[PDB]
Design a protein around this ligand. Structure first.
Ligand SMILES: CCCCCCCCCCCCCCCCCC(=O)OC[C@H](COP(=O)([O-])OCC(O)COP(=O)([O-])OC[C@@H](COC(=O)CCCCCCCCCCCCCCCCC)OC(=O)CCCCCCCCCCCCCCCCC)OC(=O)CCCCCCCCCCCCCCCCC
Ligand SMILES: CCCCCCCCCCCCCCCCCC(=O)OC[C@H](COP(=O)([O-])OCC[N+](C)(C)C)OC(=O)CCCCCCCCCCCCCCCCC
Lengths: 161, 85, 78, 231, 59, 59, 78, 59, 78, 59, 78, 78
């Protein structure tokens, strides 16, 4: 009796480059954008991806050093080698960058910036501001601040372009 | 200068002077008086403790043959570097 | 034998030295505005309080720089 | 030459006799670490590791009766001499070192040969051993030098600032009745601020310097202590 | 020689500014204004030293 | 000797510039300009020192 | 021979040197506030404890600068 | 002594260059160019210093 | 010829040089507190402990300045 | 004394080099070559300083 | 012709220059303790171990100053 | 005319200038141990190897300081 492990059914493993190996010049980055155990892009070759981390923005191009990034509610840009830009907006998650030329961006929610609307964000922001004064306790204030920050980021992303 | 003078002991009462020869001789007389009696044999540890180290040090002084000059320990003036006498 | 000499030009030399300290001040300033920017990028919501603290940093460092400059000017005119 | 003099603690000795004829609890100690050397339970030492507590307490009391009260004007630090402090530190440090050496355990010094077997013994490890043996004596010297210099510098500064304050207060207070009174008031306020700041700094520095003085000795002791585990 | 630090100080500002503009490119204007402020404050000390030098030169 | 604090400062700027380009390369064309601006200021400081070094060298 | 000379202006030189001791003091204060900003950006809720520690650091550094300035003014008046 | 700064500054540039070229190797070329630019500026300052030296040693 | 010359003012120069040591000490102290802030904003639960170590560091670093200062006094009062 | 600002600079370079080789170890060769280039330039500055020192020493 | 001059007051300059070396020692100690404070906030469990190494560095960094300090006396008392 | 002047007190200045070289050795040791503390927290499982490497670096810096002290003593005596 030996139960399997759910990772055995997934054959698309992660390719980690060895320390003492020759370098390779890459022209494309394999992106893997995921939302709630669902991918929008499957190892798509792209020219670059811009992700807003906690410390600041990161522009990931092929060959970027191995790194882990804790995302914040913000836009995410993907520019293909053709010259086409695709912009999403994420609410949180992580981004794993591999020196072998892969970037796995696993977000709790990743939705097109077009799907978002402006007036809805404005009214929700006003409601949250009104409720902040009437916050039951400190925890409610922090939660309302979180929501207000998310809405402000959404509005800034929309107004930028 | 004046600030430096503030770091001196403030309760000096009396200063006494004595030559090294004089009190060394007096100490030797005391030691001879107490180590003389017959009931303290020369082979006792007390007698040897009193005498042997002093004898050894004095012998070392006598055997000394130095090529340099050692100025007298108790000169009237030992502050002048260019006058050892 | 005694020889008392009053060299007038020396008061220039010391003055210049008193100005060298200004470097340690001026560089000091940049550091505060070298990091303030980073902080404003890390936490943009605190763009105001950080600015006030940096201005206080400028004040304290700047005050040290006037103390040196007083010696610089006193020896230039005396 | 025999000089007869007295310490500046006679009134404090009188107060100690008056106020300590009856028992009192002590709960605040400048250097508490001499009482708690072991932090992990079940560890114990066969060496007399608590022998330093009594000397530490007495040294703290003596140095505090001198240094802290020296902030009062005209109070004298009777022992303030470089070589006298050298004698004190020599006594304590060399006594503990000779206590460890009289143990006649040469393995205790194995750690002096710094590094591992990979490092060349003659050109690296032996030179590190030489430097470490030198560093022990240098630690003794630095301890006594640091205690002397702090007192000397602090009191020199206090004397000079007090002289300046006396000068301006006595010979320039008339400006209060003059048209340049604001300048004098600014200067006087600055002097008061500087006075308070200097006194607070000296009060803190004296205690901290005693703490470090005892910490150096305890570090010497701790460098050679070996702890067994209870089973 | 007082300028040696002053100039260096400016560099530090215009160093971190870049690192600050990459992390938050949306705040280039505010960071640029603060950098200009810091440059002016350092230039003040630079002019103090320059004044001393010129006075001791033409005196 | 003032130039020692000038040239070094310039290096610092460009140093950070590289780290700023390696993070957001798409912003290079902006960052570069600011970097140039910094060099245009620190260099202006050096001239002053140079000026003295010439005035005293020909007087 | 046994010649002896006293020079008047030398006290301007040494004084200036002591003023250079304020270069690293200035700088140092700078550095503290620099770090302070970053800290206040990293942990914005600690805007007062960090301020207190920065003030303590400035006070100690100012004491050192003041130790030097005493010499600077004292030689200038000797 | 000015060369003390220049030298150091040059080193600083390349220092950051490495930290940048490791972060995003794909940009090495561009970074390299900018690094050279920085060098070409710092060394320029050095020239002035050398000139002064050669204008005072041979005088 | 052979002249035993005794210049008097030199004791100022040396004194000033000693004060330059403080330029490091001061700066060093600042560095400590700088890191202290970055350490308190990175793990505030240890603030008190960290503070203690900082004070220890300050007391060790300051000690060195005193040495230099002592020398100054020795030359300034001799 | 100029050499003091040279050696330190060289140190800096190699310092960063190690960090770079720790972050992108597969890129050791390009980093090593660039570090060698930086060392050559800084050593050239030091050689100019040595040229001046020997010219004055034998003059 | 052959002229021999024996200046008596020059040892002050050498003593001050030797004392200048203490700035580096102070700065090194400050750097050590700043890094210590940063490290302990990252790995608190090992704080004690870190402290020991820090002290070691101090023991290996103060000693250098002593040598410089030693020279000062060898020139100040001679 | 030709003058052959021999000043007897110039070796003190050279000795002090050589002793200044230790301000770099001390700061280098401080940097070594600061990085050592930072690294041990990062990867405590390699404490011994890092300690060995830091000791090697300290030995090299101490060798440089020994060369500086050799020059200083040679000038002081010779
Ligand atoms: C030639 C001129 C005269 C001088 C001759 C000297 C000869 C020298 C020979 C050569 C020596 C060479 C080496 C010298 C090295 C000196 C080094 C030194 O000084 O270091 C500093 C160092 C300073 O120490 P410190 O921190 O100040 O503490 C020591 C203090 O004593 C305080 O420490 P403490 O408090 O911890 O001490 C314990 C204290 C604990 O506290 C107390 O007990 C409280 C009292 C304290 C007294 C001691 C303090 C003295 C204060 C100053 C003097 C007081 C007033 C004197 C008035 C004089 C008037 C002229 O208890 C005592 O003191 C025990 C004695 C108590 C005596 C009580 C007497 C009561 C009599 C009542 C009579 C009633 C009669 C009724 C009749 C009625 C009839 C009807 O000194 C010492 O450590 C002691 C040095 C002594 C070396 C030995 C010297 C030889 C002995 C000489 C005795 C001379 C007697 C004859 C004199 C006659 C009058 C002229
Ligand atoms: C644990 C921390 C303790 C902190 C204690 C803080 C005390 C605060 C004191 C406030 C000011 C007090 C002013 C007193 C004035 C006295 C009269 C006078 O003229 O003095 C002027 C003197 C000198 O003032 P001056 O210098 O202006 O004098 C001018 C005089 N001419 C012009 C002639 C030179 O004031 C002082 O020196 C006061 C300094 C006090 C510093 C604090 C000392 C603390 C350590 C000793 C504690 C003792 C406790 C003992 C208890 C029993 C023990 C068993």
């Amino acid at each position: 009796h030996d139960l399997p492990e759910g990772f055995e059914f997934m054959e698309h493993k992660v390719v980690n480059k060895d320390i003492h190996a020759p370098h390779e010049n890459l022209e494309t980055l394999r992106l893997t954008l995921t939302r709630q155990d669902e991918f929008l892009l499957r190892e798509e070759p792209v020219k670059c991806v811009t992700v807003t981390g906690t410390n600041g923005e990161y522009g990931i191009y092929p060959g970027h050093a191995y790194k882990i990034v804790q995302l914040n509610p913000s836009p995410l840009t993907v520019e293909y080698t053709d010259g086409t830009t695709k912009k999403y907006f994420v609410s949180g998650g992580f981004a794993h960058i591999n020196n072998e030329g892969s970037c796995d961006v696993n977000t709790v929610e990743c939705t097109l910036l077009d799907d978002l609307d402006l007036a809805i964000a404005e009214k929700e922001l006003a409601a949250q501001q009104a409720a902040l004064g009437s916050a039951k306790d400190d925890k409610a204030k922090s939660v309302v601040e979180i929501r207000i920050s998310v809405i402000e980021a959404v509005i800034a992303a929309l107004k930028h372009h | 200068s004046n600030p430096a003078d503030h770091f001196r002991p403030n309760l000096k009462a009396l200063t006494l002077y004595a030559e090294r020869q004089h009190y060394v001789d007096r100490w030797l007389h005391v030691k001879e008086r107490w180590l003389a009696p017959w009931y303290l044999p020369w082979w006792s540890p007390l007698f040897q403790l009193g005498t042997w180290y002093s004898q050894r040090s004095r012998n070392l002084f006598l055997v000394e043959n130095h090529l340099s000059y050692r100025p007298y320990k108790f000169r009237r003036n030992d502050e002048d570097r260019n006058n050892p006498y | 034998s005694t020889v008392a000499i009053s060299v007038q030009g020396l008061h220039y030399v010391g003055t210049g030295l008193a100005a060298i300290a200004l470097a340690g001040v001026g560089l000091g300033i940049g550091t505060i505005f070298g990091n303030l920017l980073v902080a404003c990028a890390r936490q943009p919501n605190l763009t105001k309080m950080l600015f006030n603290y940096a201005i206080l940093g400028f004040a304290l460092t700047e005050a040290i720089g006037l103390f040196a400059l007083m010696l610089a000017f006193l020896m230039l005119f005396s | 030459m025999f000089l007869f003099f007295f310490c500046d603690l006679f009134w404090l000795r009188l107060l100690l006799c008056m106020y300590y004829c009856v028992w009192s609890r002590l709960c605040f100690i400048v250097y508490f670490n001499c009482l708690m050397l072991i932090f992990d339970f079940l560890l114990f030492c066969l060496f007399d590791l608590y022998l330093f507590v009594g000397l530490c307490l007495f040294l703290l009391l003596w140095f505090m009766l001198f240094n802290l009260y020296s902030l009062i004007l005209y109070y004298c630090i009777t022992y303030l001499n470089l070589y006298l402090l050298f004698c004190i530190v020599f006594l304590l440090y060399i006594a503990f070192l000779f206590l460890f050496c009289f143990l006649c355990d040469f393995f205790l010094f194995n750690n002096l040969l710094v590094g591992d077997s990979f490092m060349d013994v003659f050109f690296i490890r032996f030179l590190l051993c030489f430097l470490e043996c030198f560093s022990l004596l240098c630690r003794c010297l630095s301890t006594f030098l640091r205690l002397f210099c702090n007192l000397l510098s602090s009191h020199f500064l206090l004397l000079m600032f007090f002289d300046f304050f006396y000068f301006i207060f006595v010979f320039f207070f008339y400006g209060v009745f003059c048209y340049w009174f604001i300048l004098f008031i600014f200067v006087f306020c600055f002097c008061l601020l500087f006075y308070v700041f200097l006194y607070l700094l000296d009060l803190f520095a004296a205690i901290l310097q005693l703490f470090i003085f005892c910490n150096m000795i305890l570090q010497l002791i701790m460098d050679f202590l070996l702890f067994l585990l209870f089973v």
